[PDB]
Amino acid sequence: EGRASAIRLNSAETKRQQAAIGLEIFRNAIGFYGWQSGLGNRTYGFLNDPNLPAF
């Protein structure tokens, strides 16, 4: 923290923002592609739903 503040950078704020953005990326990826639908999990996505018709 001290060395990051030495270059006028808040290490904690950047890491917290990155944590929030990573969680948002995870949510977006789950919404767009599902999560482990191949393994049998029933979390589907906008592009990976097995009920959806073929292209």
Place this chain on the structure above:
Amino acid sequence: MFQKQVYRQYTPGFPGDLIEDGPKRARPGRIMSLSAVNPAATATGPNRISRAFGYAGDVSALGEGQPKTIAARASEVVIGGANFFGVLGHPKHYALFGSAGDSLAPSYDLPDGAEGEFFDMATGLVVEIFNGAATALDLDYGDLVAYVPNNLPTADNALGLPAGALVGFKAGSMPTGLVQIPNARIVNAISLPAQSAGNLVAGVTIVQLTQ
């Protein structure tokens, strides 16, 4: 799971349902267990609805003492029938118990030693009938029904049909070792494709006339 294609009409019915009204005879029974059949169980099935259960003793007399109490006229049945008790039906009478990891998954199975009504007589009963042979078969109005027994030798059951699975067999092409349902007739006319031992091919839902 969700409608992926809109059709011009609806299905005539679902297996285990009554599609016609008229004279009919059904009796209550208890599912018992396939693990209690004396000659082991050469054929095995998960107590599905459109299956022909057979008698396996009575459970009328209650009490372990010397004076018994016959509370009600009850009978216990097994899916691999030797003497045909009845084809299980009316799936609206039961509850969706579970599917071993999915409590809400679509299942037609009954838990062991549960309640059920088995149809001896039915004006028209929607069931599923399997093919007793590896080749395709066209079943029409003038065709009979026969159900697999649990004591069916594995040589006779090459296709690996379930315990109480119903089968259409034309009129003189009965697969060896199958047990016929007397005076049972196939009302609707369908055609089942060729199948192998592994993939089978669940027979299309179809109306049959029982006794």
